[PDB]
Structures are given as structure tokens and as C-alpha cells.
Design a protein around this ligand. Structure first.
Ligand SMILES: OC[C@H]1O[C@H](O[C@H]2[C@H](O)[C@@H](O)[C@H](OCCCCC3CCCCC3)O[C@@H]2CO)[C@H](O)[C@@H](O)[C@@H]1O
Ligand SMILES: OC[C@H]1O[C@H](O[C@H]2[C@H](O)[C@@H](O)[C@H](OCCCCC3CCCCC3)O[C@@H]2CO)[C@H](O)[C@@H](O)[C@@H]1O
Ligand SMILES: OC[C@H]1O[C@H](O[C@H]2[C@H](O)[C@@H](O)[C@H](OCCCCC3CCCCC3)O[C@@H]2CO)[C@H](O)[C@@H](O)[C@@H]1O
Ligand SMILES: OC[C@H]1O[C@H](O[C@H]2[C@H](O)[C@@H](O)[C@H](OCCCCC3CCCCC3)O[C@@H]2CO)[C@H](O)[C@@H](O)[C@@H]1O
Ligand SMILES: OC[C@H]1O[C@H](O[C@H]2[C@H](O)[C@@H](O)[C@H](OCCCCC3CCCCC3)O[C@@H]2CO)[C@H](O)[C@@H](O)[C@@H]1O
Ligand SMILES: OC[C@H]1O[C@H](O[C@H]2[C@H](O)[C@@H](O)[C@H](OCCCCC3CCCCC3)O[C@@H]2CO)[C@H](O)[C@@H](O)[C@@H]1O
Ligand SMILES: OC[C@H]1O[C@H](O[C@H]2[C@H](O)[C@@H](O)[C@H](OCCCCC3CCCCC3)O[C@@H]2CO)[C@H](O)[C@@H](O)[C@@H]1O
Ligand SMILES: OC[C@H]1O[C@H](O[C@H]2[C@H](O)[C@@H](O)[C@H](OCCCCC3CCCCC3)O[C@@H]2CO)[C@H](O)[C@@H](O)[C@@H]1O
Ligand SMILES: OC[C@H]1O[C@H](O[C@H]2[C@H](O)[C@@H](O)[C@H](OCCCCC3CCCCC3)O[C@@H]2CO)[C@H](O)[C@@H](O)[C@@H]1O
Ligand SMILES: OC[C@H]1O[C@H](O[C@H]2[C@H](O)[C@@H](O)[C@H](OCCCCC3CCCCC3)O[C@@H]2CO)[C@H](O)[C@@H](O)[C@@H]1O
Ligand SMILES: OC[C@H]1O[C@H](O[C@H]2[C@H](O)[C@@H](O)[C@H](OCCCCC3CCCCC3)O[C@@H]2CO)[C@H](O)[C@@H](O)[C@@H]1O
Ligand SMILES: OC[C@H]1O[C@H](O[C@H]2[C@H](O)[C@@H](O)[C@H](OCCCCC3CCCCC3)O[C@@H]2CO)[C@H](O)[C@@H](O)[C@@H]1O
Ligand SMILES: OC[C@H]1O[C@H](O[C@H]2[C@H](O)[C@@H](O)[C@H](OCCCCC3CCCCC3)O[C@@H]2CO)[C@H](O)[C@@H](O)[C@@H]1O
Ligand SMILES: OC[C@H]1O[C@H](O[C@H]2[C@H](O)[C@@H](O)[C@H](OCCCCC3CCCCC3)O[C@@H]2CO)[C@H](O)[C@@H](O)[C@@H]1O
Ligand SMILES: OC[C@H]1O[C@H](O[C@H]2[C@H](O)[C@@H](O)[C@H](OCCCCC3CCCCC3)O[C@@H]2CO)[C@H](O)[C@@H](O)[C@@H]1O
Lengths: 82, 82, 82, 82, 82, 82, 82, 82, 82, 82, 82, 82, 82, 82, 82
């Protein structure tokens, strides 16, 4: 077992990196998704093209929070200091 | 039974990750869903294409918060430090 | 009757997780529900399609807060450290 | 009687759990309910479909706070530490 | 006339419970009622249905703040620690 | 005369319980009132029904802040600790 | 002439109650009044029914802040503790 | 020339009460006044009815801040403790 | 000269009283005045009725800050403690 | 070159007075002037009336920030304590 | 060289007096400018009158931040204490 | 397993870099993509152009959060101090 | 080479002045510019009158931030104290 | 290795520089890019003119963050103090 | 390898200046750019006039952040004290 400052900072850091990490993307995806379904009702014929661009967008946004997830796991599993 | 700083942090870290980490995704899902039923109401014939594109979005968004859940479960059940 | 830091941290943590945890999803569910009723007033024939999609959405949002409910219940009944 | 740090944290925790845990669902129901009635005015023949779907959603949000309540009640009546 | 940390946290917690706990429901209700009177003016003939559903929502919202009151009262008249 | 922590926490608690207590309801009532007068201009014939539902609403909202007022007076006049 | 903590708090408590306690009600009244004169302008014939329903609202809202005023006067002129 | 805590607390308290105290009512009065002039431009014949209702509203809002002015003046000239 | 805690609090207090006490009325007048002129443009023959009513309201808000000013001036020139 | 708490609070208070004291009037004026130039474009023929009332409002708003300047100058050139 | 508290408070004060000082006017001017150019596109004939009233407005707003600038320079160059 | 201030600041900085750094891009992208799917529904025939420019923007925005990741990685895998 | 409090403040003061001092003016300029190109697009013939009135505004706004820049350069290059 | 206060400040500083420095430009690009595509949909023949101008602006904002990046990289790889 | 307060203050200061410094201008540039593209879609013939005005605006906003870049670079490479 270990318990210095760094271990403590590490676990908090981990949590913040995904907690704060998901706020922007959280909102972002909601926005895009909303527009796409509204679009799909307007032009059902256009669903595939829309579904396609939505996904491209959803990728980019989810990547942002995964960067936090990645940092979090380096801090818990591959921690460079403790 | 253990108690030090790192354990105290670990539990606060847990809650923040899962708590904070829900703010964005939750607002986002509400936005996406609202638009979809509004969509369905406009063009009922398009329900399926909407329900489908919506399930897509919801997963991406939900997954965002599931990253925080993961971090919490590690901190609680597979802690590297304590 | 133990009262170290980690017990006081736990109780605080359990509260935050489930309290902060409900903000986004509480708001979002309202957004979704609102559109659904406005929808049902516009196309009462589409009630069931609307109702089903809404019900699905609500579950997705309800989960988000349930993750904070699960972390809280571990911290109270399955506490790893104290 | 007993007045350690954990009993102190426990009272505050219990209050935070329901004080904050109501903000989200509090706004949410008001949005949903507002929509409902406005719809009922525009389309009175849909009252039962509206009212019904509305009632459904209302439950979901109400639960979001009842989770905070539950935690509060444990921290008070079934406290695991003090 | 006993005075300790736990008694101090108890009076503060009591107020925060009830006090913060009004913000959400207070706004939410205004929102719902605003729509109702607007609706009642658009379709006086629907007043009954509108009044009826409004009362339903009010109740659901009032109950959110009552939970805070409930805690406040426990902390002040059935405090488990002091 | 008395002056421990609890007396001090008590007086502050009292103030917050009504100060914060009135914010939500404060806004809420403004909203509903506004809509009702706007409604009354639109359908003067409908004034009684409107005036009726407004009042029902204004009750509910004022009750929320009175819960704070009640806590405040227990803290000043029926204080359980000091 | 007295000075301790509880007296120092009592005065800060006073101001907060009356200060904070005005924020909501003040915004709310502005909203209600604005709508009423706008109302009056639209349908001048309906002045009286508006003036009347408005006086109603204003009282409920004003009363909210008067609760804070009461708490302050007690803290200053009928203090239980100091 | 006394300078205990309670005198420094008083001066701070007097300032807050009258400063914070003016935020809501300052905003609200503007809201009301705005509608009133926009109104008078729409129905110059209704000027006096509008003007009278406005004048009444303004007084209600002005009181709110005057309560913070009264607490301030006690704290400076009728201070109970110091 | 003299530099106790109360003189220190007194300068800050005096500044807070007018710095904050202007925010509310500051926005309020701008809203009111904006409306006024816009109305005058739409309905120039109403200039005197507009301008007059506007002037009235402007006074009311201006007073809200003059209260902060008054307090400031007392804390500075007629200080009851230091 | 005297230096004490009261002199430090005096320089800070001076800046906050003038600095914070600009936020409200600054926004308010922009608002009022924005309407005026918009109005002057809608009805060039009314420029004179519009310019005239705008100047009135500007003055009322400028005076709010001047109060802060006034305090700033007293604290810096006629400080009563140091 | 000099370095007491006051020198330190002085330099910070200076910075805040212009930093915070420019926020309101910063926004304010943007608003007015925007409206004036929008106005100028609408009524090019009316450019001179508009350009005139804009400038009058821009003066007033810039003066607010100069009051901060003035305080800042008294603090750095004509500092009354240090 | 070294632990010092600099190592603690390093884990926290790493998380804040990536975590805070997502807020802007996350929202921005949602905004951009929301418009794209809306556009693709308005003019399916333009999908190609719309998709193409959207990808350009996404890239520019993704690169903003990547800078934070980059720092996070330096601090964690090429830390210059520890 | 010097180091004390006043020098440490001087550098933090510098950044705040130039950093904070850009917030308002930056948002304001964006607003003014946006409106102008929108203006130009509507009435291309009026470009010059817009470009001209815009340059005017931009200078006033930019100047606001230049006050903060000045304060920083003094603090760094012509410090009165250190 | 070395772990003074300046290395600690240096890591945090470097993270703040890019975490915060992205918020502004992050939202900005999303707004700009959203507009762009929406325009391209309405007016596909203008794609190259739109896309081009858009690209231009995108650079400008991207630079705003690259400045934070640059600072970060200096504080890390070319640190002037530690 | 010096590490006094003023070096740690410098590094923090450099970061803030350039990070906070980019918020307003980052947002504002987006606002301007958005209007410009929407504009170019409305009047592709006006592209060059629009494009030129935009380019001018962007430079004005870019400067604002460049002032924070200049203060940062002094603090790192031309530091007056340390
Ligand atoms: O006190 C002796 C210990 O001191 C060092 O760290 C000490 C340090 O001195 C002390 O300030 C620290 O308490 C500081 C509490 C800071 C709380 C902080 C708040 C936000 C970020 C996360 C948590 O505890 C450390 C425990 O290791 C060493 O790391 C440790 O090996 C050594 O035994
Ligand atoms: O200083 C006494 C001893 O304290 C150390 O740990 C101490 C540490 O220094 C101290 O800051 C800590 O109390 C600090 C309380 C901070 C509360 C914290 C804030 C946010 C995160 C959750 C809660 O207690 C530790 C108990 O493990 C170690 O036991 C030992 O190295 C050291 O000698
Ligand atoms: O009961 C004695 C225990 O002391 C330690 O905790 C100490 C700790 O050192 C001390 O800083 C701490 O006071 C620190 C107050 C921090 C407030 C904290 C903020 C987050 C939410 C909970 C409240 O009190 C503890 C009392 O137990 C250890 O946690 C524990 O191992 C040990 O047994
Ligand atoms: O021995 C006398 C009693 O003292 C203890 O409490 C002590 C405690 O150690 C001390 O930190 C405490 O001062 C701590 C001040 C904390 C302020 C608090 C923070 C959140 C809630 C509102 C305000 O004072 C208590 C005494 O009034 C114990 O709580 C109690 O069991 C014991 O009987
Ligand atoms: O260190 C002395 C005692 O420490 C513990 O409680 C101490 C604690 O350390 C101390 O920080 C505490 O005062 C510190 C202030 C606590 C603020 C906190 C903020 C949110 C949660 C509620 C209150 O007083 C307690 C009085 O018992 C335990 O009672 C026991 O380990 C030990 O007797
Ligand atoms: O210091 C001796 C006294 O200690 C206890 O309380 C002490 C306590 O120790 C001390 O931390 C406390 O000062 C703590 C100041 C906390 C200020 C707090 C901030 C927000 C909530 C309201 C006010 O003063 C109490 C005065 O009673 C007992 O209550 C008292 O009987 C005893 O005489
Ligand atoms: O510790 C010394 C003595 O202090 C006690 O009271 C002390 C108390 O402990 C202390 O925290 C307090 O100073 C604390 C200053 C906190 C400022 C407060 C914060 C928010 C509410 C308004 C202002 O002064 C009291 C004076 O009555 C009692 O006089 C006595 O029991 C004790 O022995
Ligand atoms: O003049 C000596 C007086 O000391 C006490 O107050 C002390 C107190 O103990 C001490 O914590 C206090 O320093 C505490 C600083 C708290 C700052 C406070 C925050 C709220 C707004 C006002 C400023 O200084 C007082 C100086 O008087 C008592 O209030 C008074 O009975 C006694 O006569
Ligand atoms: O004896 C030398 C002088 O010292 C006293 O002030 C002392 C005081 O006791 C002490 O708390 C003070 O440090 C207190 C630091 C408080 C920071 C302050 C908070 C708000 C306003 C801006 C920053 O230092 C003063 C000395 O520079 C008295 O104020 C003065 O009358 C006396 O002549
Ligand atoms: O305790 C020493 C002195 O305490 C009083 O003033 C003390 C006070 O206690 C102390 O907290 C204070 O420094 C404490 C910092 C005060 C911060 C406060 C925050 C907002 C209001 C303005 C500043 O310094 C004073 C210097 O005189 C009185 O001057 C006198 O009772 C006594 O001589
Ligand atoms: O410590 C001895 C010195 O004490 C006085 O001031 C001392 C004072 O005691 C001390 O609290 C102070 O440190 C207090 C640090 C407060 C930081 C503050 C935070 C916001 C406002 C700007 C900065 O340092 C002063 C340096 O002069 C006298 O001014 C000085 O002549 C004397 O030599
Ligand atoms: O107290 C020891 C000595 O400290 C004095 O200066 C001290 C001062 O007291 C102390 O608060 C200070 O450390 C205070 C650190 C506060 C950080 C500050 C907060 C915001 C503004 C930027 C950073 O260091 C000074 C070094 O010049 C003087 O050197 C001397 O008069 C005194 O005897
Ligand atoms: O001697 C052991 C080591 O201790 C020093 O660091 C000490 C330092 O003095 C002390 O203030 C520190 O406690 C300070 C707590 C500050 C909390 C911090 C604030 C922002 C970043 C997250 C949390 O503890 C360190 C020990 O763990 C040095 O940093 C290091 O070089 C040295 O080798
Ligand atoms: O005073 C002891 C040492 O002080 C300096 O660093 C000290 C410093 O004074 C102390 O406040 C510090 O702990 C204090 C907490 C610092 C918080 C800060 C907040 C944002 C920036 C990052 C962290 O620990 C250092 C450990 O080295 C220098 O290392 C050196 O002058 C000396 O050896
Ligand atoms: O290296 C020893 C140096 O000590 C002084 O600074 C001391 C100072 O007294 C002490 O309060 C300080 O700890 C204070 C911690 C304040 C944290 C601060 C917050 C703003 C951003 C940067 C971090 O540590 C310094 C360590 O150097 C002087 O600055 C310098 O003249 C002297 O040479």
C-alpha cells in the first residue's frame, strides 16, 4: 500500500480528467444528435447522408473525453511517479 | 480496515467522477431525445429512422459517463495505491 | 463507532455523487418529456411512437444518476477501506 | 451525545444529498409540466394521452431526488460509521 | 445548552436542506403555472383539465422541497447524534 | 447571554434558510404572475378562471419559502441545542 | 456593549437575510409588472382586472422578502442569544 | 474608538445589505419601466393607466432595497451590541 | 493614523456599498432607457409621455444606488465606531 | 511611506469601487445607445428627440459609476483614517 | 526600493481597476457599435446622425474605464501612502 | 516511488490540461456538426461540400484539445523536473 | 535580481491587467464586426460608411484594453516600488 | 530530481496556459464553422468563397491557443528559472 | 536554478495572461467570422468587401491576445526582477 501526496493527487486527477472531460463533449453530442434527428424528420430521404456525417462528428467529440480517460488510466495503472 | 489521505481522496475522487461526469451527457441526452419525439410527431412515418439514429447518439453520450463509472469502480474495487 | 477522515469523506462523497449526479439528467429528462407532450398534442395519433421513444430516452438518463446511486451505496455498505 | 467529524459530515452530507439533488429534477418537472398543460390547451381531446405520458416522466425525475433522500435517510437512521 | 461541531453542522445543514432545496421547485412551478394561466386564456373551456394536471405537477414539485424539510425536521427534532 | 459555535451557526443558518429560500419562489411567482396578467389582457372574459389558478400556484410557491421561515424560527425561538 | 462571535454573526446574518432575500422577489416583481403594463397597453379596457391580479401577485412576492426582514429584526432587536 | 470584531462585522454587514439588496430590484424596476414605455408608445391614450400601475410596481420594488437600507441604518445608528 | 480592523473593514465596506450597489440599477436604467428611445422612434408624437414616464423610473433606480452611496459616506465621514 | 492594514484595504477598496462599479453602467449604456442608433435609422426624423432622451439616460447611468470614483478619490485624497 | 503590504496591494489594485474596469464598457461599446452599423446599412442616408449619436455614446462608456485608469495611475505615480 | 510537490502538481496539471481543454472544442464541434446535419437535410445535394468543410473545422477544433493531451503526455512521460 | 512580495504581486498584477482587460473588449469587437459584415452583405453599396464607423468603434474598444497593457508595462519596466 | 516551488508552479502554469487558452477559440471556431456549413447549404455555388474565408478565420483563432501552447512549451523545455 | 516566490509567480502569471487573454477574442473572432460567412452566402458578389472588413476586424481582436503574449514573453525572457 502507498499513501503520499502524489498517490492522492493522482486519484483526484484521474477523476477530474474524465468528470470535467465529459462536460463539453457531453453537451456537444446532444446538440448534433438533436439536429440530425430533426433533419431526419425533415428529409427522410436524406437519412443515410445525415447518419453518416453525425457519426463522423460523434467520433471527434468522444475522442476528446477519451484523452481524459487515457490520462486517468496512466495515473492509476501506468503511474510514472507512484 | 485502512485510513489515510489517499483513501480519503479515493472516495471523493470516486463521487466526483461519476457525479460531475453526468452533467454534460445528461443535458445532451435530453436535447437529443426532445428533438427526436418532436421529430416523430412531425413525421410519424419516419419513427424508425429517428429511433435508430437516436439510439446511436444516446450510446456515445452514455459511454462518456461510463468512463467516469469505470474510474470510480477502479478507485473502489481495484485501487492501485490503497 | 469509528470516525477517521475516510468515514467523513465517505459520507460527503456519497451525498455529492447522488446529488450532483442528478442535475444534468434531471434537467435533460424534463427537456425530453416537454417535447414529448408538445408532440402528443400536435399528433395524438403518434402518441405510442412518441411514448415509446421517450420511455427509452428516460431510461438512458435515469442510468446516469443510478451510477451515482451505486457509488453511494458501495461507499455506505461495501466500503473498501473503512 | 457523540460529536466526532463523521457525525458532523453526516448531517451536512444528508442535507447536501437532497438540497442539491432537487435542483435538477425541480427545473425538469416544471419544464415538462408546463409543456403538458400548454399542449392540453391547444389540444384538449388529447388530455388523457398528455396527462398520462406526463405522469410517467414525472415519476422518473422524482426518483432522481428520492435517491438523494434515500442516502440522507441512511446517513441518518442507518449510519454505517457513527 | 450543548454545543459541538455536530450541533453546529446540524443547524447549518437544516437550513441548507430547506433553503437550497427551494431553488429548483420554485422555478419549476412558476414555469408550469405560467403555462397554465396562458393556456387557460387560450382555451378557457379547458380550464378544468388544465387546472387538474397543473395541480398534479405542483404536487410532484412540492414534494421535492418537502424532502428537504423532512431532513431539516429530523436534524432538529430527532437528531440521531446529538 | 450565550455565545458558542452553535448559537453563531444558528443565526447564520436562520438567515440563509430564508435568503436562499426565497430565490426560486421569488423568480417562480414573477413568472406565473406575468403570464396571468398577459392572459387576462388576452381573454378578459377568462379572468376569474385565471385569477383562480394563479392563486393556487402562488400558494404552492410561497409554501417553499415558508419552510425556510419555519426552520429559521425553530432556530431562534425553539432551538433544540442552544 | 457586547462583542463575541455570536454577535458578529448576528449582524452578518441580518444583512444576508434582507440582502440575499431580495434578489428573487425583486426580479420576479419586475417581470410581473412589465407584463401588466404591456397588458394594459394592449387592452386598456382591462386595466382594473390587471391592476387587481397584479396587486395580488406583488403581495405574495413582497411577503417573501418580508420574511427575511423579520429574521433580521429579531436578530437585531429580539436576539435569543445575545 | 472601539474596534472589536462586531464593529468590523457591522460595517461590512451594512454595506452588503444595501449593495446586494439593490441587485434584484434594480434589474426588476428596469424590466417594468421598459415595458411601460414600449407600452406608452403603442397606446399613448393608455399613458395614465400604464403610468399609474408602473408607479405602484416601482414602489413595491423600491421597498425591497429599503429594507436593506433600514438594516444598514440600525447597524450604524441603533446597533444593538456595539 | 489609526489602523485597526474596523477602519480597514470600513474602507472596503464603503467601496462594496457602491461598487455592487450599482450593478443592478446600472443594467436596469439601460434596459428602461433603451426601450424608451426605441418607443420614441416608433411613435415620436409620444416623446413627452415616454420621456416623462422614463425620467420617473430613472429616479427610482438611481436611488437604489444612492443608498449605497449614503452608507459609504457615513462609513467615511460620520463613522460610528472609528 | 506609512503601511498598515487600513492603507492596504484603502488602495484595494479604491480600485474595486471604480472597477466593479463600471460593469452595470457599461452594459446598460451600450444597451440604451444600441437602441438609439437603431431608432435613429428607423426614423431619422426623430433623431433630435432620440438623441435628447439618450443623453438623459447616459447621464443617469454615468452618475452611478461616478459615485464609485467619488469614494475612490475620498479614500485616496481625503482618507479619514490614514 | 519599497516592499510592504501597501505597495503590493497598490499594484494589484491598479491592475484590477482597469481589468475589471473594461468589462462592462467593453461589452457595452460592442453592442452600440453593432447596432449603428446595422442601422447604417438600413438607412445609409442616416449615417451622419447615427455616427454622431454613436460617438456621444462611445464617449460616456470609455469614460467609465478611464476612471479606473485614473485610479491606477494615482496608485503607481501619485500614491498617497507609499 | 518518488513523491514531492512537483510530482503532485504534475499529475493534477496533466488532468486539468486534457480535462478543461475539452470544454471549448466539445461545445464548438457539436455546434458545427449540428449545423452540418441540418444543412445536409436542407440541401442533400450539397452533402459532399458540407461534409468536406465540416471535417476541416473538426480537425482545427480537435487540434486545440490535442495540445492539452500533448502537455499531459510530456508531464507524464517526459517530465523535465521529475 | 530582486524578490519580495511586491515584485511577486507586480508580475501577477501585470498578467491580470492584460488578461482580464481583454475579456470585454474582445467580445465587444466580435459583436461590432459581425454586424458590420452582415451589414455589408445586406447593402454592399454602403461598405465604406460601415467600414468607417466600424474603425471608429474598434479603436475605442481596443483602447480599453490598451489601458491594461499600459499598466502592465509600467509594472514591469517602470515600477515605482521595485 | 529537483522539486522546488517554481517547478511545481511551472507544470500547473503550463497546463493552465493551454487548458484555459482553448475555451475561447474552441467555442469560436464551432460558431464560425457552423455558420460556414449552413451557408454552404443555402448557397452551394459559394462553397469556395465560404470555405476560403472560413479557413482564414480558423487560423486566427487557432493561433490564440498556439500562444498558450508556446508558453507551455517554454515553461517545460526552455524554462528560464528551473 | 533559482526558485523564489517571484519565479513561481512569474510562471503562473505568464500562463494566466495568455490563457485568460484568449477567451474574449477567441469568442469574438468566431462571432465575426460566423456573420462573414453567412454574409458571403447571402451576397457572394460582396465577398471581397466582406472578406476585407473581416480581415481587419480579426487583426484588432488578435492584438488583444498578443498583448498577453507580450507580457508572458517579458516575464519569461525579459523579467525585470528575477
Ligand atoms: O509528513 C511526512 C510526509 O510528508 C510528505 O508528504 C506529506 C506532506 O508533507 C503533507 O503536507 C501532506 O498533507 C497535505 C494535504 C494536502 C491535501 C491535498 C488537497 C488537494 C490535492 C490533494 C490533497 O501529506 C503528505 C503525506 O505524504 C511525504 O510525501 C511523505 O513521504 C512523508 O512521510
Ligand atoms: O504530519 C503527520 C503525518 O501525516 C501524514 O499523513 C497525513 C497528512 O500529512 C495530512 O495532511 C492529512 O490531513 C489533511 C486533511 C486534508 C483533507 C483532504 C482534503 C481534500 C481531499 C480529501 C480530504 O492526514 C494524513 C493521514 O495519513 C503521514 O501520516 C505522515 O507521513 C506524517 O508524519
Ligand atoms: O481517528 C484518528 C485518525 O486520524 C486521521 O485523520 C485525521 C486527520 O489527520 C486530520 O487532518 C483530520 O482533520 C482534517 C479536517 C479536514 C476536513 C474534511 C474535508 C473533506 C470532507 C471531510 C472533512 O481529522 C482526522 C481525524 O481522524 C486518519 O485518517 C486515521 O488513520 C486516524 O485513525
Ligand atoms: O470537547 C468538547 C467538544 O468539542 C469537539 O468539537 C470541537 C472541535 O474539536 C473543533 O474542531 C471545533 O472547531 C472547528 C471549527 C469548524 C467550523 C465549522 C465547519 C463546518 C460546519 C460549520 C462550522 O470546535 C468544537 C468545539 O466547539 C467535539 O466535536 C465534541 O465531541 C466535544 O465534546
Ligand atoms: O484530532 C482530534 C479528533 O479528530 C477527529 O475529529 C476532529 C477533527 O480532527 C477536526 O479536524 C475537526 O475540526 C475540523 C473542522 C472540520 C470541518 C468539516 C467540514 C465539512 C464536514 C463537517 C466539518 O474536529 C473534530 C472533533 O472531533 C476525531 O474526533 C478523532 O480522531 C479525534 O478525537
Ligand atoms: O475555545 C473555547 C470554546 O470552544 C468551543 O467552541 C469554540 C471553538 O473551539 C472555536 O473553534 C470557535 O471558533 C471557530 C470559528 C468558526 C467561524 C464559523 C464560520 C462559519 C460558521 C459560523 C462561524 O469558537 C467557539 C466558541 O465557543 C465551545 O463551544 C466553548 O464552550 C468553549 O468555551
Ligand atoms: O480561543 C479563545 C477564546 O475564543 C472564544 O471565542 C472566540 C472564538 O474562539 C474565535 O474563533 C473568534 O474569532 C474567529 C473569527 C472568525 C470571523 C467570523 C467568520 C464568519 C462570521 C463572522 C466573523 O472570536 C471569539 C470571541 O468570542 C471564547 O472567547 C473562549 O471560549 C475561547 O477560549
Ligand atoms: O478588541 C479585542 C476584541 O477581540 C475580539 O475580536 C477579535 C477576534 O478574537 C479575532 O479573531 C479577530 O480576528 C479575526 C479576523 C476575521 C476577519 C473578519 C471577517 C468578517 C468581516 C470582518 C473581519 O480580531 C478581533 C479583534 O478585536 C472580540 O470581538 C472582542 O470582544 C474583544 O474586545
Ligand atoms: O503595528 C504596525 C501596524 O500593524 C497593524 O497591521 C498589521 C496587522 O496586525 C496584520 O494582521 C496585517 O496582516 C494581515 C494580512 C491581511 C491581508 C489583507 C486582507 C484584506 C485587505 C488586503 C489584504 O499586517 C499589518 C502590518 O502591515 C495595524 O493595522 C497598524 O495600526 C499598526 O500600526
Ligand atoms: O489582535 C490584535 C488587534 O486585533 C484587532 O485588529 C487586528 C485583527 O485582530 C487582525 O485579525 C487583523 O488582521 C487579520 C486580517 C483581516 C482581514 C480583513 C478582511 C475584510 C475586512 C478588512 C480586513 O489585523 C488587525 C490589526 O489591528 C484590533 O486592532 C485590536 O483588538 C488588537 O490590537
Ligand atoms: O513582517 C514585518 C513587516 O510587517 C508589515 O507588513 C507585513 C505583514 O506583517 C505581513 O502579514 C504581510 O504578509 C501578508 C501576505 C498577504 C498577501 C496579500 C494577498 C492579497 C492582497 C495583496 C497581498 O507582509 C507584510 C510585509 O511588509 C510591515 O508593513 C513591514 O514594514 C514589516 O517589516
Ligand atoms: O515575516 C518575515 C518577513 O516577511 C516579510 O515579507 C514576507 C511577507 O511577510 C510574507 O507574507 C510573504 O509570503 C506570503 C506569500 C503570499 C503569496 C502571494 C499571494 C498573492 C500575491 C502573490 C503571492 O513573503 C514576504 C517576503 O518579502 C519581510 O521580509 C519582513 O518584514 C518580515 O519579517
Ligand atoms: O524533502 C522532501 C521533498 O519535500 C518538498 O515538498 C514538500 C513541501 O515542502 C510541502 O510544502 C508540501 O506540502 C504542501 C501542500 C500543497 C498542496 C498542493 C497544492 C497545489 C498542487 C496540489 C496540492 O509537501 C512536500 C512533501 O511531500 C520538496 O518539494 C521536494 O523537493 C523535497 O525533496
Ligand atoms: O521554505 C522552504 C523552501 O521554500 C521554497 O519552496 C517551498 C515553498 O516555500 C512552500 O510554500 C511550498 O509549499 C506551499 C504550497 C505551494 C502551493 C502552490 C500553489 C500553486 C503553485 C504550485 C503549488 O513548498 C516548497 C518546497 O520547496 C523553495 O524550495 C526554497 O526557497 C525553500 O527550500
Ligand atoms: O528562496 C528563498 C526566498 O523566500 C521568499 O519567498 C518565499 C516566501 O517567503 C514563502 O511565503 C513562499 O511560500 C508561500 C506560498 C504561496 C504560493 C504562491 C501563490 C501564487 C503563485 C505562486 C505560489 O515561499 C517562498 C520560497 O522562496 C522570497 O521570495 C525570496 O526573496 C527568498 O530568496
Amino acid at each position: 500500500m502507498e499513501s503520499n501526496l502524489t498517490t492522492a493527487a493522482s486519484v483526484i486527477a484521474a477523476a477530474l480528467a474524465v468528470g470535467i472531460g465529459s462536460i463539453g463533449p457531453g453537451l456537444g453530442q446532444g446538440q448534433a444528435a438533436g439536429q440530425a434527428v430533426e433533419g431526419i424528420a425533415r428529409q427522410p430521404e436524406a437519412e443515410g447522408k445525415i447518419r453518416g456525417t453525425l457519426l463522423l462528428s460523434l467520433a471527434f467529440m468522444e475522442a476528446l473525453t477519451i484523452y481524459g480517460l487515457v490520462v486517468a488510466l496512466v495515473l492509476l495503472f501506468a503511474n510514472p511517479f507512484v
